[PDB]
């Protein structure tokens, strides 16, 4: 579905936060380019949380509706609360 | 409920199959929540309504006592 | 709203479970803004009326402008909106808070 | 005594008036509020050896939206009804041109009569109520919420809003005591409106199956 | 369906999915439990 | 064994694995159980 007619809530769920951080941490561990200046940080999971709070994570969340439709939300488009 | 000077609005049973046969699936949905509430709250304990409600909805969404 | 509540709670048990503890948030505000309750307030009572109306439009549980959506939107938030109006009313913001 | 039958006949009738009104048939307030004393003043003191005999207090009512949509209510003389009675009432429904009737069966029906209502079903809709099912209006009970029959336009708007399919709605069986009271049939939907202690109000939809 | 290693997820990502395909563009689904992204082409 | 699939969807309906509707909003209400608190209505009890 397009960027308009998004009916799902603009907040990131806790389940999305968990998997986005988990997935981005493994990417950073697999030498994926890091989207922020790491000030001597080395734990990939703390870098992922750093990238999340910067809204720098290059991930899109495909949310499936119970009709089988889906919405694509960029991680930076969601309201991030932790 | 049919007898004279009995109150037909409030008079109620703890037998839920009588309620299904006399009053149907929505009265069961309420009476079941009352029965589950009574066993929990009798010893003073408290459970959030949304758990009581969700169980009673699951046991009745089919249209009969599951 | 008072007659609506007297349908919803025929026993008159006023104890209710709701998301936002309004009295504590008021007390937090009184402390955060150093409010002297013996002086008269600069809070215009119309801003109390306008603000609660404009707040209530943002407590959205059911999206969309369709009338069945709006009927669901109103029903989902009915009890909290009655409580919100019973507390953030213009008089209590002048006599109590 | 002879008065218990008069009290029964009145109380059954009062329930039928409320049922007809709840279905949307044109019922006058004077018949909805009719007291035992006014019922007795119209129909007499005792039905055994007297005026309010069975059939006599037969009712006929017309719909609010259309004057030609009309429904009978019958109080058979047969305590257990046979085809002998139903086929006569069908003839009367042909003559007076009435598509629906309610039969206030006292004790039961023969299996052939019970079958005959289905064998006539798409032509003449006959519905059976036992006498004891009408001594109380179960919709006045505090456990039974408000039930509202939706129209096909509303059901179409409902399913378009939530993108549902009818089978994804929760369901109510056509033999449910309230689905019979509203005379509802398969594939219709009821809007149910109930007080919610968390939200204040909640609306539920049952598909009839 | 190309699999791409996370080391390539820099600016040259789309160029690499071509350059790799020309040695061996859809939505790249991230595989759960792995860094590799799967692109249908 | 019955309820294990009953879940809040991105539609904010509560549905089973079959996508049958159990509730149109969670708890009739749409709110998580962890956030709510006991409160008093104030308007309910006072005399006229």
Short mmCIF file of C-alpha atoms in Angstrom, two decimals:
data_model
loop_
_atom_site.label_atom_id
_atom_site.label_comp_id
_atom_site.label_asym_id
_atom_site.label_seq_id
_atom_site.Cartn_x
_atom_site.Cartn_y
_atom_site.Cartn_z
CA UNK A 1 0.00 0.00 0.00
CA UNK A 2 1.02 3.61 -0.63
CA UNK A 3 2.32 6.08 1.95
CA UNK A 4 -1.22 7.45 2.33
CA UNK A 5 -4.11 5.40 3.75
CA UNK A 6 -1.79 4.01 6.42
CA UNK A 7 -4.26 2.96 9.13
CA UNK A 8 -1.81 1.26 11.51
CA UNK A 9 -0.64 3.25 14.51
CA UNK A 10 2.34 5.59 13.94
CA UNK A 11 4.14 4.25 17.03
CA UNK A 12 6.68 1.45 16.83
CA UNK A 13 5.52 -1.52 18.89
CA UNK A 14 7.78 -3.12 21.48
CA UNK A 15 7.88 -6.26 19.32
CA UNK A 16 9.10 -4.19 16.36
CA UNK A 17 11.69 -2.46 18.58
CA UNK A 18 12.94 -5.86 19.79
CA UNK A 19 13.30 -7.37 16.30
CA UNK A 20 14.65 -4.19 14.67
CA UNK A 21 17.40 -3.95 17.29
CA UNK A 22 18.08 -7.69 17.12
CA UNK A 23 18.25 -7.68 13.32
CA UNK A 24 20.33 -4.50 13.06
CA UNK A 25 22.75 -5.76 15.73
CA UNK A 26 23.45 -8.91 13.70
CA UNK A 27 23.96 -6.76 10.59
CA UNK A 28 26.47 -4.57 12.44
CA UNK A 29 28.18 -7.74 13.69
CA UNK A 30 28.34 -8.90 10.05
CA UNK A 31 30.33 -5.74 9.13
CA UNK A 32 27.29 -3.84 7.82
CA UNK A 33 28.10 -0.12 7.47
CA UNK A 34 27.24 1.87 10.60
CA UNK A 35 25.12 4.99 10.12
CA UNK A 36 26.48 6.97 13.10
CA UNK A 37 29.86 8.00 14.49
CA UNK A 38 30.65 5.37 17.12
CA UNK A 39 32.64 7.14 19.85
CA UNK A 40 34.63 4.02 20.65
CA UNK A 41 31.53 1.87 21.12
CA UNK A 42 32.05 -1.77 20.14
CA UNK A 43 29.03 -3.84 21.23
CA UNK A 44 26.88 -4.16 18.07
CA UNK A 45 23.65 -4.23 20.13
CA UNK A 46 24.47 -0.91 21.82
CA UNK A 47 25.34 0.52 18.40
CA UNK A 48 21.94 -0.66 17.10
CA UNK A 49 20.23 1.09 20.02
CA UNK A 50 22.35 4.16 19.24
CA UNK A 51 21.22 3.95 15.60
CA UNK A 52 17.58 3.47 16.64
CA UNK A 53 17.53 6.59 18.82
CA UNK A 54 19.19 8.49 15.96
CA UNK A 55 16.51 7.06 13.61
CA UNK A 56 19.37 5.94 11.36
CA UNK A 57 18.48 2.24 10.98
CA UNK A 58 17.99 1.38 7.25
CA UNK A 59 15.03 -0.94 7.83
CA UNK A 60 11.39 -0.95 6.72
CA UNK A 61 8.65 -2.74 8.66
CA UNK A 62 6.01 -4.51 6.57
CA UNK A 63 2.89 -4.72 8.74
CA UNK A 64 0.32 -7.28 7.60
CA UNK A 65 -3.39 -6.63 8.10
CA UNK A 66 -5.80 -9.53 8.70
CA UNK A 67 -7.23 -9.06 5.19
CA UNK A 68 -3.77 -9.86 3.77
CA UNK A 69 -2.96 -6.27 2.82
CA UNK A 70 0.23 -4.69 4.13
CA UNK A 71 1.72 -1.32 5.08
CA UNK A 72 5.42 -0.50 4.71
CA UNK A 73 6.68 1.80 7.49
CA UNK A 74 10.24 3.08 7.51
CA UNK A 75 11.76 2.77 10.97
CA UNK A 76 12.39 6.54 11.01
CA UNK A 77 8.69 7.10 10.25
CA UNK A 78 7.55 5.46 13.50
CA UNK A 79 7.44 7.19 16.88
CA UNK A 80 10.20 5.56 18.94
CA UNK A 81 9.66 5.71 22.67
CA UNK A 82 12.32 3.71 24.55
CA UNK B 1 -39.42 -16.38 36.16
CA UNK B 2 -43.06 -16.87 35.10
CA UNK B 3 -44.48 -16.96 38.64
CA UNK B 4 -46.44 -14.08 40.16
CA UNK B 5 -44.53 -11.54 42.31
CA UNK B 6 -41.17 -12.96 41.21
CA UNK B 7 -38.96 -10.23 39.70
CA UNK B 8 -38.41 -11.28 36.06
CA UNK B 9 -35.65 -8.71 35.41
CA UNK B 10 -33.13 -9.63 38.12
CA UNK B 11 -33.86 -13.26 39.07
CA UNK B 12 -30.91 -15.30 37.83
CA UNK B 13 -29.28 -18.73 38.12
CA UNK B 14 -25.71 -19.93 38.59
CA UNK B 15 -26.52 -22.78 36.17
CA UNK B 16 -25.24 -21.48 32.82
CA UNK B 17 -26.94 -24.09 30.60
CA UNK B 18 -30.32 -22.94 31.93
CA UNK B 19 -29.30 -19.39 30.96
CA UNK B 20 -28.33 -20.49 27.44
CA UNK B 21 -31.66 -22.27 26.96
CA UNK B 22 -33.83 -19.54 28.53
CA UNK B 23 -31.91 -16.37 27.62
CA UNK B 24 -29.35 -17.22 24.93
CA UNK B 25 -25.77 -16.54 23.97
CA UNK B 26 -25.45 -12.90 25.08
CA UNK B 27 -26.93 -13.55 28.53
CA UNK B 28 -24.45 -16.44 28.77
CA UNK B 29 -21.64 -14.05 27.79
CA UNK B 30 -22.60 -11.86 30.77
CA UNK B 31 -23.51 -14.62 33.25
CA UNK B 32 -20.25 -16.46 32.54
CA UNK B 33 -18.24 -13.32 33.34
CA UNK B 34 -20.24 -12.97 36.58
CA UNK B 35 -19.46 -16.57 37.55
CA UNK B 36 -15.75 -16.23 36.75
CA UNK B 37 -15.69 -12.93 38.66
CA UNK B 38 -17.41 -14.50 41.69
CA UNK B 39 -14.88 -17.32 42.12
CA UNK B 40 -11.98 -14.85 41.76
CA UNK B 41 -13.34 -12.03 43.93
CA UNK B 42 -14.84 -14.17 46.72
CA UNK B 43 -11.37 -14.54 48.27
CA UNK B 44 -10.81 -10.78 47.81
CA UNK B 45 -8.46 -11.17 44.83
CA UNK B 46 -8.67 -9.02 41.70
CA UNK B 47 -8.08 -9.71 38.00
CA UNK B 48 -8.28 -7.14 35.20
CA UNK B 49 -11.61 -7.20 33.35
CA UNK B 50 -9.96 -7.62 29.92
CA UNK B 51 -8.89 -11.17 30.82
CA UNK B 52 -12.33 -12.18 32.10
CA UNK B 53 -13.92 -10.56 29.02
CA UNK B 54 -11.59 -12.21 26.50
CA UNK B 55 -12.21 -15.72 27.88
CA UNK B 56 -15.99 -15.23 27.88
CA UNK B 57 -15.83 -13.90 24.31
CA UNK B 58 -13.74 -16.88 23.16
CA UNK B 59 -16.13 -19.37 24.81
CA UNK B 60 -19.15 -17.73 23.10
CA UNK B 61 -18.08 -16.29 19.72
CA UNK B 62 -19.28 -19.58 18.16
CA UNK B 63 -22.93 -18.95 19.09
CA UNK B 64 -23.18 -21.86 21.52
CA UNK B 65 -21.45 -23.04 24.69
CA UNK B 66 -18.12 -24.37 23.40
CA UNK C 1 -22.72 12.24 31.28
CA UNK C 2 -24.01 11.85 34.86
CA UNK C 3 -27.15 10.10 33.58
CA UNK C 4 -25.02 7.94 31.27
CA UNK C 5 -22.87 6.86 34.24
CA UNK C 6 -25.99 6.04 36.27
CA UNK C 7 -26.95 3.59 33.53
CA UNK C 8 -23.46 2.08 33.29
CA UNK C 9 -23.01 1.75 37.09
CA UNK C 10 -26.48 1.03 38.54
CA UNK C 11 -24.91 0.24 41.93
CA UNK C 12 -23.21 3.63 42.20
CA UNK C 13 -19.78 2.07 42.72
CA UNK C 14 -17.56 4.97 41.62
CA UNK C 15 -14.33 2.93 41.66
CA UNK C 16 -13.21 2.59 38.05
CA UNK C 17 -10.08 1.52 36.17
CA UNK C 18 -8.73 3.97 33.58
CA UNK C 19 -5.42 4.75 31.84
CA UNK C 20 -4.40 8.18 33.20
CA UNK C 21 -4.51 9.08 36.90
CA UNK C 22 -5.86 12.62 36.57
CA UNK C 23 -5.72 13.68 40.24
CA UNK C 24 -2.07 12.63 40.53
CA UNK C 25 -1.20 14.43 37.29
CA UNK C 26 -2.91 17.56 38.65
CA UNK C 27 -0.93 17.23 41.89
CA UNK C 28 2.26 16.78 39.86
CA UNK C 29 1.42 19.99 37.97
CA UNK C 30 0.70 21.91 41.19
CA UNK C 31 4.16 20.89 42.46
CA UNK C 32 6.04 21.37 39.17
CA UNK C 33 4.69 24.91 38.67
CA UNK C 34 4.97 26.01 42.33
CA UNK C 35 1.27 26.83 42.46
CA UNK C 36 0.22 28.90 45.46
CA UNK C 37 -3.43 27.87 45.97
CA UNK C 38 -4.27 30.93 48.10
CA UNK C 39 -3.81 33.45 45.24
CA UNK C 40 -6.23 33.92 42.32
CA UNK C 41 -5.37 32.09 39.10
CA UNK C 42 -4.54 33.48 35.66
CA UNK C 43 -6.19 30.43 34.01
CA UNK C 44 -9.13 31.65 31.93
CA UNK C 45 -12.05 29.19 32.36
CA UNK C 46 -12.72 29.21 28.59
CA UNK C 47 -9.26 27.77 27.97
CA UNK C 48 -10.33 24.94 30.30
CA UNK C 49 -13.42 24.33 28.14
CA UNK C 50 -11.53 24.72 24.84
CA UNK C 51 -8.60 22.59 25.99
CA UNK C 52 -10.64 19.57 27.09
CA UNK C 53 -12.54 19.64 23.78
CA UNK C 54 -9.28 19.84 21.80
CA UNK C 55 -7.71 17.13 23.98
CA UNK C 56 -10.66 14.73 23.55
CA UNK C 57 -10.21 14.84 19.75
CA UNK C 58 -6.69 13.40 20.16
CA UNK C 59 -7.53 10.35 22.31
CA UNK C 60 -8.21 8.25 19.22
CA UNK C 61 -8.75 4.50 19.56
CA UNK C 62 -10.76 4.10 16.33
CA UNK C 63 -9.45 5.89 13.23
CA UNK C 64 -11.44 7.20 10.26
CA UNK C 65 -14.24 9.67 9.59
CA UNK C 66 -16.84 7.07 8.57
CA UNK C 67 -19.90 7.31 10.87
CA UNK C 68 -19.62 3.72 12.13
CA UNK C 69 -15.95 4.41 12.91
CA UNK C 70 -16.94 7.58 14.79
CA UNK C 71 -19.65 5.73 16.72
CA UNK C 72 -16.99 3.18 17.69
CA UNK C 73 -14.49 5.96 18.43
CA UNK C 74 -17.02 7.61 20.77
CA UNK C 75 -17.98 4.33 22.46
CA UNK C 76 -14.38 3.19 23.06
CA UNK C 77 -13.55 6.41 24.94
CA UNK C 78 -16.93 7.22 26.54
CA UNK C 79 -16.09 6.47 30.18
CA UNK C 80 -12.64 8.11 30.10
CA UNK C 81 -14.13 11.22 28.46
CA UNK C 82 -16.82 11.47 31.14
CA UNK C 83 -14.08 11.22 33.79
CA UNK C 84 -11.90 13.74 31.93
CA UNK C 85 -14.76 16.27 31.79
CA UNK C 86 -15.70 15.58 35.43
CA UNK C 87 -12.17 16.58 36.51
CA UNK C 88 -10.72 19.12 34.06
CA UNK C 89 -13.90 21.22 34.32
CA UNK C 90 -13.66 25.01 34.54
CA UNK C 91 -15.05 25.29 38.09
CA UNK C 92 -12.82 22.69 39.77
CA UNK C 93 -9.84 24.30 38.01
CA UNK C 94 -10.86 27.47 39.91
CA UNK C 95 -12.25 26.20 43.23
CA UNK C 96 -10.12 23.08 43.78
CA UNK C 97 -7.00 22.78 41.62
CA UNK D 1 -58.78 -21.54 39.43
CA UNK D 2 -60.47 -20.07 36.36
CA UNK D 3 -58.53 -16.83 36.92
CA UNK D 4 -55.05 -18.31 36.39
CA UNK D 5 -56.00 -18.96 32.75
CA UNK D 6 -57.19 -15.35 32.39
CA UNK D 7 -53.96 -14.09 33.99
CA UNK D 8 -51.94 -16.32 31.64
CA UNK D 9 -53.83 -15.24 28.49
CA UNK D 10 -53.34 -11.56 29.37
CA UNK D 11 -49.65 -11.97 30.23
CA UNK D 12 -48.96 -13.94 27.04
CA UNK D 13 -50.79 -11.28 24.99
CA UNK D 14 -48.83 -8.44 26.61
CA UNK D 15 -45.56 -10.17 25.65
CA UNK D 16 -46.77 -10.63 22.06
CA UNK D 17 -47.62 -6.92 21.77
CA UNK D 18 -44.10 -6.02 22.93
CA UNK D 19 -42.66 -8.59 20.51
CA UNK D 20 -44.71 -7.23 17.59
CA UNK D 21 -43.65 -3.68 18.49
CA UNK D 22 -40.01 -4.78 18.80
CA UNK D 23 -40.27 -6.35 15.34
CA UNK D 24 -41.54 -2.97 14.09
CA UNK D 25 -45.25 -3.73 13.68
CA UNK D 26 -47.72 -0.93 14.45
CA UNK D 27 -48.96 -1.58 18.00
CA UNK D 28 -51.02 1.02 19.84
CA UNK D 29 -49.82 2.09 23.29
CA UNK D 30 -53.26 1.19 24.70
CA UNK D 31 -52.55 -2.46 23.86
CA UNK D 32 -48.92 -2.33 25.01
CA UNK D 33 -49.95 -0.96 28.43
CA UNK D 34 -53.20 -2.99 28.65
CA UNK D 35 -53.75 -4.03 32.27
CA UNK D 36 -55.32 -7.28 33.41
CA UNK D 37 -58.41 -5.26 34.35
CA UNK D 38 -58.69 -3.75 30.86
CA UNK D 39 -57.95 -7.14 29.28
CA UNK D 40 -60.67 -8.68 31.46
CA UNK D 41 -62.95 -5.74 30.61
CA UNK D 42 -62.44 -6.47 26.90
CA UNK D 43 -62.25 -10.28 26.75
CA UNK D 44 -64.09 -11.43 29.90
CA UNK D 45 -63.45 -13.06 33.24
CA UNK D 46 -62.68 -16.70 32.38
CA UNK D 47 -61.91 -18.58 29.14
CA UNK D 48 -63.32 -21.89 30.31
CA UNK D 49 -67.10 -21.51 29.95
CA UNK D 50 -66.72 -17.95 28.74
CA UNK D 51 -65.78 -15.35 26.18
CA UNK D 52 -61.93 -15.36 25.98
CA UNK D 53 -61.86 -18.82 24.41
CA UNK D 54 -58.95 -19.79 22.19
CA UNK D 55 -59.00 -18.29 18.67
CA UNK D 56 -61.13 -15.43 20.02
CA UNK D 57 -58.14 -13.35 21.18
CA UNK D 58 -56.38 -13.88 17.85
CA UNK D 59 -54.26 -10.85 16.91
CA UNK D 60 -53.48 -9.25 13.54
CA UNK D 61 -50.98 -6.40 13.07
CA UNK D 62 -49.51 -4.40 10.18
CA UNK D 63 -45.91 -3.28 9.72
CA UNK D 64 -44.80 0.31 10.35
CA UNK D 65 -43.00 0.75 7.03
CA UNK D 66 -45.63 -0.91 4.81
CA UNK D 67 -49.38 -1.40 5.35
CA UNK D 68 -49.52 -4.60 3.27
CA UNK D 69 -46.81 -6.36 5.30
CA UNK D 70 -49.00 -7.99 7.95
CA UNK D 71 -48.69 -10.80 10.50
CA UNK D 72 -51.15 -13.00 12.38
CA UNK D 73 -50.83 -14.31 15.91
CA UNK D 74 -52.93 -17.41 16.64
CA UNK D 75 -53.89 -19.12 19.91
CA UNK D 76 -54.90 -22.64 18.83
CA UNK D 77 -57.71 -24.62 20.42
CA UNK D 78 -55.59 -27.75 19.95
CA UNK D 79 -53.22 -28.05 22.95
CA UNK D 80 -50.92 -30.09 20.69
CA UNK D 81 -51.30 -28.74 17.17
CA UNK D 82 -51.75 -30.88 14.07
CA UNK D 83 -51.73 -30.25 10.34
CA UNK D 84 -55.52 -29.97 10.68
CA UNK D 85 -54.96 -26.55 12.28
CA UNK D 86 -51.95 -25.28 10.30
CA UNK D 87 -53.55 -25.92 6.90
CA UNK D 88 -56.68 -24.04 8.00
CA UNK D 89 -54.51 -21.10 9.12
CA UNK D 90 -52.68 -21.26 5.79
CA UNK D 91 -56.03 -20.98 3.99
CA UNK D 92 -56.88 -17.95 6.16
CA UNK D 93 -53.44 -16.52 5.34
CA UNK D 94 -54.25 -16.99 1.65
CA UNK D 95 -57.68 -15.37 2.01
CA UNK D 96 -56.63 -12.40 4.15
CA UNK D 97 -53.33 -12.32 2.18
CA UNK D 98 -51.05 -12.53 5.23
CA UNK D 99 -47.52 -13.86 4.74
CA UNK D 100 -46.57 -14.36 8.42
CA UNK D 101 -48.20 -15.82 11.49
CA UNK D 102 -47.19 -16.73 15.03
CA UNK D 103 -48.74 -19.85 16.57
CA UNK D 104 -48.91 -19.74 20.38
CA UNK D 105 -48.79 -23.50 20.88
CA UNK D 106 -49.98 -24.57 24.33
CA UNK D 107 -48.19 -27.92 24.69
CA UNK D 108 -46.54 -28.95 21.42
CA UNK D 109 -47.02 -30.14 17.86
CA UNK D 110 -47.03 -33.43 16.01
CA UNK D 111 -43.79 -34.03 14.06
CA UNK D 112 -45.69 -33.69 10.76
CA UNK D 113 -46.89 -30.23 11.79
CA UNK D 114 -43.32 -29.32 12.79
CA UNK D 115 -42.16 -30.52 9.35
CA UNK D 116 -45.02 -28.76 7.52
CA UNK D 117 -43.74 -25.35 8.68
CA UNK D 118 -40.50 -26.05 6.78
CA UNK D 119 -42.38 -27.54 3.81
CA UNK D 120 -44.30 -24.24 3.63
CA UNK D 121 -41.39 -22.07 4.81
CA UNK D 122 -40.53 -20.12 1.60
CA UNK D 123 -44.25 -19.52 0.93
CA UNK D 124 -45.81 -18.85 4.36
CA UNK D 125 -43.53 -18.23 7.35
CA UNK D 126 -45.04 -19.93 10.40
CA UNK D 127 -43.27 -19.67 13.76
CA UNK D 128 -44.11 -21.62 16.91
CA UNK D 129 -43.96 -20.34 20.49
CA UNK D 130 -44.80 -22.40 23.55
CA UNK D 131 -47.18 -20.79 26.03
CA UNK D 132 -44.46 -20.84 28.71
CA UNK D 133 -41.97 -19.11 26.41
CA UNK D 134 -44.22 -16.02 26.45
CA UNK D 135 -45.14 -15.68 30.13
CA UNK D 136 -41.96 -13.58 30.41
CA UNK D 137 -40.46 -11.12 27.94
CA UNK D 138 -36.86 -12.36 28.17
CA UNK D 139 -35.66 -9.15 26.50
CA UNK D 140 -36.66 -7.33 29.71
CA UNK D 141 -34.17 -9.49 31.64
CA UNK D 142 -31.09 -7.61 32.86
CA UNK D 143 -28.70 -10.21 31.38
CA UNK D 144 -30.11 -9.83 27.85
CA UNK D 145 -28.63 -6.73 26.14
CA UNK D 146 -30.28 -4.61 23.45
CA UNK D 147 -30.41 -6.49 20.12
CA UNK D 148 -30.95 -4.55 16.87
CA UNK D 149 -31.49 -6.28 13.51
CA UNK D 150 -29.28 -4.64 10.88
CA UNK D 151 -30.38 -3.95 7.32
CA UNK D 152 -28.46 -5.30 4.33
CA UNK D 153 -27.17 -1.78 3.62
CA UNK D 154 -25.84 -1.59 7.18
CA UNK D 155 -24.38 -5.11 6.95
CA UNK D 156 -22.72 -4.12 3.66
CA UNK D 157 -21.28 -0.97 5.27
CA UNK D 158 -20.19 -2.98 8.32
CA UNK D 159 -18.27 -5.53 6.24
CA UNK D 160 -16.74 -2.77 4.09
CA UNK D 161 -15.55 -0.85 7.17
CA UNK D 162 -13.79 -3.79 8.86
CA UNK D 163 -13.03 -5.62 5.56
CA UNK D 164 -14.62 -8.71 7.09
CA UNK D 165 -16.32 -11.71 5.55
CA UNK D 166 -19.62 -12.78 7.10
CA UNK D 167 -18.07 -16.00 8.42
CA UNK D 168 -15.48 -13.89 10.31
CA UNK D 169 -18.22 -12.37 12.48
CA UNK D 170 -19.13 -14.13 15.72
CA UNK D 171 -22.37 -16.00 15.33
CA UNK D 172 -25.82 -16.54 16.82
CA UNK D 173 -27.90 -19.65 16.18
CA UNK D 174 -31.34 -19.11 14.65
CA UNK D 175 -32.81 -21.10 17.55
CA UNK D 176 -31.39 -18.66 20.10
CA UNK D 177 -34.24 -17.44 22.36
CA UNK D 178 -33.64 -13.81 21.30
CA UNK D 179 -33.13 -14.53 17.58
CA UNK D 180 -36.55 -16.20 17.66
CA UNK D 181 -38.06 -13.23 19.55
CA UNK D 182 -36.88 -10.90 16.77
CA UNK D 183 -37.91 -13.53 14.19
CA UNK D 184 -34.45 -13.46 12.61
CA UNK D 185 -33.27 -15.94 9.98
CA UNK D 186 -30.00 -17.25 8.56
CA UNK D 187 -27.59 -14.73 7.06
CA UNK D 188 -29.02 -11.74 8.88
CA UNK D 189 -26.89 -9.83 11.41
CA UNK D 190 -27.78 -8.42 14.84
CA UNK D 191 -26.11 -5.31 16.22
CA UNK D 192 -25.82 -5.85 20.00
CA UNK D 193 -25.27 -2.79 22.22
CA UNK D 194 -24.13 -3.35 25.80
CA UNK D 195 -22.63 -1.34 28.67
CA UNK D 196 -18.88 -1.83 29.10
CA UNK D 197 -17.28 -1.25 32.49
CA UNK D 198 -13.98 -0.37 30.79
CA UNK D 199 -15.13 1.71 27.80
CA UNK D 200 -18.71 2.61 28.79
CA UNK D 201 -20.32 1.16 25.66
CA UNK D 202 -19.46 -1.66 23.28
CA UNK D 203 -21.20 -2.78 20.07
CA UNK D 204 -21.08 -6.45 19.01
CA UNK D 205 -22.29 -8.05 15.76
CA UNK D 206 -23.60 -11.63 15.55
CA UNK D 207 -24.15 -13.36 12.22
CA UNK D 208 -27.24 -15.58 12.35
CA UNK D 209 -26.41 -19.23 11.61
CA UNK E 1 16.85 -14.52 -5.92
CA UNK E 2 20.18 -12.96 -4.98
CA UNK E 3 21.46 -13.15 -1.41
CA UNK E 4 23.66 -10.20 -0.41
CA UNK E 5 26.01 -10.14 2.60
CA UNK E 6 25.53 -7.20 5.03
CA UNK E 7 29.09 -5.98 4.30
CA UNK E 8 27.68 -4.61 1.01
CA UNK E 9 24.80 -2.60 2.55
CA UNK E 10 26.53 0.69 1.80
CA UNK E 11 25.59 3.20 -0.92
CA UNK E 12 26.73 0.77 -3.66
CA UNK E 13 24.08 -1.76 -2.53
CA UNK E 14 21.92 -1.60 -5.66
CA UNK E 15 24.97 -1.50 -7.95
CA UNK E 16 26.32 -4.60 -6.19
CA UNK E 17 23.07 -6.58 -6.60
CA UNK E 18 23.46 -5.93 -10.33
CA UNK E 19 27.23 -6.54 -10.45
CA UNK E 20 26.73 -9.81 -8.54
CA UNK E 21 23.80 -10.82 -10.76
CA UNK E 22 25.96 -10.08 -13.81
CA UNK E 23 28.57 -12.44 -12.33
CA UNK E 24 26.18 -15.27 -11.40
CA UNK E 25 15.29 -5.06 -8.35
CA UNK E 26 12.65 -6.25 -5.90
CA UNK E 27 12.08 -5.66 -2.20
CA UNK E 28 14.98 -7.08 -0.21
CA UNK E 29 13.43 -9.17 2.56
CA UNK E 30 15.69 -9.58 5.58
CA UNK E 31 15.89 -13.26 6.52
CA UNK E 32 15.16 -13.94 10.22
CA UNK E 33 18.23 -15.34 11.95
CA UNK E 34 20.66 -14.32 9.20
CA UNK E 35 22.29 -11.14 7.95
CA UNK E 36 21.72 -11.99 4.29
CA UNK E 37 19.05 -10.03 2.43
CA UNK E 38 17.13 -11.79 -0.35
CA UNK E 39 16.43 -9.76 -3.50
CA UNK E 40 14.19 -11.14 -6.25
CA UNK E 41 15.31 -9.98 -9.69
CA UNK F 1 -4.92 -24.88 23.79
CA UNK F 2 -7.97 -22.85 22.72
CA UNK F 3 -6.76 -19.29 23.39
CA UNK F 4 -3.10 -19.56 22.32
CA UNK F 5 -3.79 -18.01 18.89
CA UNK F 6 -6.10 -15.23 20.15
CA UNK F 7 -4.13 -12.09 19.39
CA UNK F 8 -4.32 -8.34 18.74
CA UNK F 9 -3.85 -7.62 15.03
CA UNK F 10 -2.53 -4.46 13.35
CA UNK F 11 -6.23 -3.79 12.68
CA UNK F 12 -6.48 -3.43 16.51
CA UNK F 13 -9.11 -6.17 16.38
CA UNK F 14 -8.56 -9.29 18.47
CA UNK F 15 -8.65 -12.37 16.23
CA UNK F 16 -7.76 -16.04 16.28
CA UNK F 17 -5.60 -17.88 13.74
CA UNK F 18 -8.67 -18.15 11.45
CA UNK F 19 -8.91 -14.33 11.54
CA UNK F 20 -12.37 -14.64 13.09
CA UNK F 21 -13.23 -11.60 15.19
CA UNK F 22 -13.19 -12.23 18.93
CA UNK F 23 -13.34 -8.54 19.89
CA UNK F 24 -13.42 -5.37 17.80
CA UNK F 25 -11.11 -3.67 20.31
CA UNK F 26 -9.02 -5.32 23.01
CA UNK F 27 -10.90 -5.42 26.30
CA UNK F 28 -13.76 -3.55 24.58
CA UNK F 29 -11.38 -0.69 25.19
CA UNK F 30 -8.12 -0.80 23.17
CA UNK F 31 -5.83 -0.41 26.20
CA UNK F 32 -3.07 -2.54 27.68
CA UNK F 33 -3.86 -3.90 31.14
CA UNK F 34 -0.54 -2.78 32.63
CA UNK F 35 -1.11 0.99 32.30
CA UNK F 36 -4.61 1.47 33.76
CA UNK F 37 -5.24 2.42 37.40
CA UNK F 38 -8.09 2.61 39.89
CA UNK F 39 -9.84 6.00 39.86
CA UNK F 40 -13.12 7.54 41.03
CA UNK F 41 -15.77 9.02 38.74
CA UNK F 42 -16.65 11.92 41.12
CA UNK F 43 -19.78 12.86 39.12
CA UNK F 44 -21.59 9.55 39.78
CA UNK F 45 -22.45 9.71 43.50
CA UNK F 46 -23.27 13.36 44.48
CA UNK F 47 -26.89 14.35 45.03
CA UNK F 48 -28.58 16.69 42.56
#
